[PDB]
């Protein structure tokens, strides 16, 4: 007789954003799904498992939301710190319990662990055949 029924585990929801770990000896890329809630720490159950010997299990939580308006999809990220070890976002200490994170945002967990967040959308393109024309305020040089 078997000893397994139904589905308990749950992962690989839907691609949306990623986390890049800035290290002077390497780099680490993490995948962020539309789980509404993301866990960061040492707990394997958490969303993102850092490589720190003293990384808080509940270190921090990230809210991944995806909504469609007009035609495209607008995603927003929220940072929540339980307050215990030490989490720094945007190079500054967090005080509020409802920080809004967007594309191109540097995040630091603990003190040394530093990573940048950016939306993955689906599949980026190269800058070899992608010219940037001035009209919708894209650049200024």
């Amino acid at each position: 007789k078997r000893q397994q029924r139904s589905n308990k585990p749950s992962s690989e929801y839907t691609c949306l954003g990623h986390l890049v770990n800035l290290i002077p000896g390497k780099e680490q890329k993490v995948e962020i799904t539309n789980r509404n809630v993301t866990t960061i720490g040492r707990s394997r159950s958490c969303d993102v498992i850092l490589s720190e010997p003293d990384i808080s299990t509940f270190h921090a939580e990230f809210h991944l939301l995806q909504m469609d308006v007009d035609n495209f999809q607008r995603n927003l990220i929220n940072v929540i710190d339980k307050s215990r070890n030490g989490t720094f976002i945007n190079g500054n200490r967090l005080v509020k319990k409802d920080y809004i994170l967007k594309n191109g945002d540097r995040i630091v967990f603990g003190k040394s662990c530093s990573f940048l967040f950016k939306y993955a959308s689906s599949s980026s393109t190269d800058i070899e055949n992608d010219d940037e024309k001035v009209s919708s305020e894209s650049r200024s040089y």
């Binding site: 394997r44 808080s56 299990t57 270190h59 070890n85 003190k111």
Partner: peptide
């Protein structure tokens, strides 16, 4: 998967 809880830092 059993991981060590939170700890103190320097």
């Amino acid at each position: 998967n059993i991981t060590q809880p939170t700890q103190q830092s320097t």
